[PDB]
Structure 1
Amino acid sequence: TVNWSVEDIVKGINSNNLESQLQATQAARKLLSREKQPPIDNIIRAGLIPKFVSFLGKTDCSPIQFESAWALTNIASGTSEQTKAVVDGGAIPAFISLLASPHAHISEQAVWALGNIAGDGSAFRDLVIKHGAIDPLLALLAVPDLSTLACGYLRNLTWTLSNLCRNKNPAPPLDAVEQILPTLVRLLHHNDPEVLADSCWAISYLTDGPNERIEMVVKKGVVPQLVKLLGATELPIVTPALRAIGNIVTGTDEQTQKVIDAGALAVFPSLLTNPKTNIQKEATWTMSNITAGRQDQIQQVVNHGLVPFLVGVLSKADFKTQKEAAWAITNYTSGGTVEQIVYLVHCGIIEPLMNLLSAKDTKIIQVILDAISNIFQAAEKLGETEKLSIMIEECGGLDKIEALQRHENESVYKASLNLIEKYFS
């Protein structure tokens, strides 16, 4: 019951009376579940964790199993030090044993607890896996139709599975990922918004790594569903779906092509103008890795009408987004055909590119100077350098370039002078 002192909780838990122990454990749970500043450290210092862990095994008193599971879940929701206290008390195998509880609310609470422990970081994630958590977790989801499961239960299962997919140095064990993926792909087709969001997060973590990890995911055929979720009205779904798509196009040309083949580029007029600045940034970053691809992939960018959207972002966007756009342009001009590059200029890339040369940011200045060099090399292939030179002078570009001559950074000077020397002298 309500607002016990820690002193009274300890007295109750130290009684040799299981019903007294239950009342005291519920009182601890309520303290730990209040809105403001749960006294986690006070409960830890009182030495209560080993008793709570012992209560997880009291099969004939399912209420104290539930109450201690909740209390421990909330201690483990805290700092790494607080999560470690729960693990140090032997809680991981006790919670795994509760996954097979005939009481659904107790099984669910154990799922949640293991999610908190795994969510601490890669070491505790891997320790939860070594204790054998994955088989019984997946067994709870081995049903013909996920819709027969309680919505809250299914959401907790999905979230906990996503933490087993989360974090790097190291990434999760390859065999654990393979074991989880088929269930994860089913969750990715479930019609609940929170299950969809957490499934996308899981996929985004799994694709955040070397191309071999990306391939494990792409082979399971998820890209079309990711592209569908790219267009969800829910921002909590779009954000991780976009991260996952973005991760995939950091991969091989073939992996990138799967994204293009599933129709992803048709969603980018909206993504590149999205009111959430983080979405615009991630979408432009994604575009920059696609224009880093083959000439036929650059051509698909052109065919979907996306070069004017890059011109737009270069013209006006949050500065970090403009940066990604500069990179998209330098990549485009690096790998593209002469005709592709010419098309870029006709779309109006030069003036907004020149205006960003005012940036008090060294990296983007280098990136922009590189693109200009690239565009000049295409123009002389057509023997039209002065024509481009004129365009740069008129919009004030030449002024900035000969300003970048007095610049502090090595490579910026050399790039600036060489431009002046070859095309403006």
Structure 2
Amino acid sequence: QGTVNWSVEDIVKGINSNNLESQLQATQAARKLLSREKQPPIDNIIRAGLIPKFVSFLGKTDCSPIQFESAWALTNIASGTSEQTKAVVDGGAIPAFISLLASPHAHISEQAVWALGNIAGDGSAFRDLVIKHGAIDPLLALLAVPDLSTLACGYLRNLTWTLSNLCRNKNPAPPLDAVEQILPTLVRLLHHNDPEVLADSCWAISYLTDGPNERIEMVVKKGVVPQLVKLLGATELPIVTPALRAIGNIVTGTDEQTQKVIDAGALAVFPSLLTNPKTNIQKEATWTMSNITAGRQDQIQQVVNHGLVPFLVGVLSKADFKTQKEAAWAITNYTSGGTVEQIVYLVHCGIIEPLMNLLSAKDTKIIQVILDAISNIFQAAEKLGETEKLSIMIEECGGLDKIEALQRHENESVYKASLNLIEKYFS
């Protein structure tokens, strides 16, 4: 109760005293200000020039309590805007926090982990600077135990979180060797039984797979895909979300990389994902499906075998517009790479009507996408001499009325494609 709601000037008075105990008390008072529920006075603390004092306090092995209070204070300053985080880094906090990772006091070590997480979390530059200062080794050493279950819950969550921030951000992506250094521990965390650890582990993996094929490969070669697929079926949404994010990222890679996702049994989870009550899950799942239908004919076939086409018809028929649009993409990709048989199967499942209904949308891109798909479907119909059966099917659901109208469209590509369709299959 004695260090509650001090003014900044009193905090300064105590910290500038030559009395370690007075300094400890003032530092704690600063910590409590910075820990309050509402509007922590971060800038006032910075302007008082307190950061260098806090950083020096980090080095006081002789007085662990002031180490902890200043660590906590600096953590909260670093949790703010980029400028506020910069002030902490500018004060030399990075190497000081890294030295603290080795502290015999778990709560102090944990605090340093947290602070480094905030710093790395600011962006690529601070992320890489934290790495250059040598944070990874001591961080990983804290997790070098026979069984993660012996570690304190909060402690393990903080470590996992800070690691995921080290895996986060692009332009540039994290250093290749740093990723390689981290991955094995990350794979181990991905098998832990704590929901929070699992969520953050998945987020890390999703960050690492958000890039070119080579980055995806680094992850896939670690054999995590089956575990990701398992996590994809979890009951917890905060686990399913990053798990699905990662799987989606992986299938943006090569067909061989996509095949690993299929082989691991991912497609069997999609009936649920494509009807998931969470809008974002349906969108992400449909987007993922579109990149799978952009693959090989044998990969399209597995989509067929898993009974996923009716589910695509479903989302095309009714879903959030953004989702419907991913569905349109999935269809064009499907029709562009599929065999004749696969394409006819698509029409038999009822793709045509919900496709036509989306033509009335005021989004220029999806219209192009849908028009292209129709052209693809017609092409398959020509090889069957059933172009007329398609034209009527389109006519009867009011598709012709929409396409005819599209001959008068702002976009050039639109009316040209529609005009073409008219004088080729109608007229």
Specify the TM-score bucket, using the shorter chain as the normaliser: over 0.9
Helix, strand or coil: the match of 2:346? Answer: helix
State the aligned residue count.
425
Matched residue SS, 2:234: coil
Shift in Å at residue 65 of structure 1?
Answer: 0.2
Aligned match of 1:166 in 165, 168, 171? Answer: 168
Q: TM-score, normalised by structure 2?
A: 0.99
- Residue 126 of structure 2 corresponds to which residue in structure 1? 124
Counterpart position of 2:72:
70
Which of 397, 410, 422 aligns to 1:420? It is: 422
Q: Distance in 2 between matches of 1:274 and 1:46?
A: 51
Paired with 1:168 and 1:259, the residues of 2 have a C-alpha distance of: 24
> Deviation digits for residues 275-315 of structure 1, max 9, x if unmatched?
00000000000000000000000000000000000000000
SS at match of 2:193: coil
Please report how far the alpha carbon of residue 214 of structure 1 lies from its aligned counterpart in structure 2 after TM superposition.
0.2
SS in 2 for 1:16: coil
Provide the rounded CA distance (Å) in 1 between the counterparts of 2:147 and 2:293. 41
Displacement of 1:108 after TM fit? 0.1
Deviation at 1:34, TM superposition (A): 0.3
Could you tell me how far 1:44 is from its partner in structure 2? 0.3
Q: CA deviation at 1:48?
A: 0.2
Residues in 2 aligned to 1:201 and 1:417: alpha-carbon distance in whole angstroms: 46
Q: How many Å apart are 1:340 and its aligned residue?
A: 0.1
Query: Per-residue deviation at 1:179?
Result: 0.2
2:170 aligned counterpart, secondary structure:
coil
> Take 1:156 and 1:279, find their aligned partners in 2: how far apart are those partners?
27
Measured against aligned partners, the alpha-carbon deviations of 1:340-379 in whole angstroms (never above 9, x if no partner) come to 0000000000000000000000000000000000000000
How many Å separate the matches in 2 of 1:326 and 1:138? 45
Q: Deviations over 1:46-88 (max 9, x none)?
A: 0000000000000010000000000000000000000000000
CA distance in structure 1 between the partners assigned to 2:408 and 2:221 by the alignment = 52
Alignment of 1:378-397 (within 5 A): 378-397=380-399
SS at match of 2:319: coil
Q: Distance in 2 between matches of 1:44 and 1:357?
A: 56
Distance, in Å, in 1 between the alignment partners of 2:170 and 2:284 is 20
Aligned counterpart, 2:273: 271
- The CA deviation at 1:167 is 0.1
Task: Give the distance between the partners of 2:31 and 2:90, measured in 1 at CA.
Answer: 19
Map 1:18-417; keep pairs closer than 5 Å.
Answer: 18-417=20-419
Distance in structure 2 (CA, Å) of the matches to 1:406 and 1:257: 43
Distance of 1:65 and 1:407 partners within structure 2: 68
Question: How far did residue 386 of structure 1 move?
Answer: 0.5
Q: Distance in 2 between matches of 1:331 and 1:248?
A: 17
Cα deviation for residue 91 of structure 1 reads 0.1
Q: Deviation of residue 41 (structure 1)? A: 0.3
Offset of 1:90 from its aligned partner?
Answer: 0.1
Deviations 1:249-287 (CA, angstroms, capped at 9, x unpaired)? 000000000000000000000000000000000000000
* Per-residue deviation, residues 103-158 of structure 1 (Å, max 9, x unmatched): 00000000000000000000000000000000000000000100000000000000
Cα separation, 2, equivalents of 1:18 and 1:124 = 32
Offset from partner CA, 1:138-190 (integer Å, 9 cap, x none): 00000010000000000000000000000000000000000000000000000
Classify the secondary structure of the residue corresponding to 2:21.
Answer: helix
**1:195 Cα deviation after fit:** 0.1
**CA distance in 1 between partners of 2:40 and 2:210 (Å):** 35
> What RMSD over aligned residues (CA atoms) do the two structures have, in Å?
0.3
Distance in 2 of aligned mates of 1:280 and 1:17: 60
Residue 245 of structure 1 and its aligned partner are, at CA, apart by 0.1
Cα distance in structure 1, aligned partners of 2:61 and 2:100? 10
In structure 1, list runs of 5 or more residues that go unmatched. Answer: none
Partners of 2:267 and 2:295 in 1: how far apart? Answer: 14
Q: What displacement does 1:192 show?
A: 0.2
Following TM superposition, by how much is the alpha carbon of 1:416 offset from its aligned partner in structure 2, in angstroms? 0.4
Instruction: Please give the alpha-carbon distance, in whole angstroms, between the structure 1 residues aligned to 2:410 and 2:254.
Output: 37
Shift of 1:400: 0.2
Alpha-carbon shift at residue 397 of structure 1 (Å): 0.1
Q: Distance in 1 between matches of 2:6 and 2:373?
A: 68
Q: Distance in 1 between matches of 2:372 and 2:251?
A: 23
1:330: how far off?
0.1
If the length of structure 1 is used for normalisation, what is the TM-score? 1.00
Structure 2: segments with no counterpart, 5+ residues: none
Separation of aligned partners in 1, 2:242 and 2:20: 46
SS state of the match for residue 40, structure 2?
coil
CA distance in 2, matches of 1:263, 1:392: 36
Indicate the percent of aligned positions where both proteins have the same amino acid. Answer: 100
Distance 1:170 1:407 in 2: 41
Between the aligned partners of 1:361 and 1:281, the Cα distance in structure 2 is 17
Instruction: State the 1:230 CA deviation.
Output: 0.3
* Partners of 1:156 and 1:234 in 2: CA distance: 20
Give distance in 2, aligned partners of 1:235 and 1:63.
39
Q: In 2, Cα distance between the equivalents of 1:374 and 1:381?
A: 11
Distance in 2 (CA, whole Å) between partners of 1:361 and 1:262 is: 36
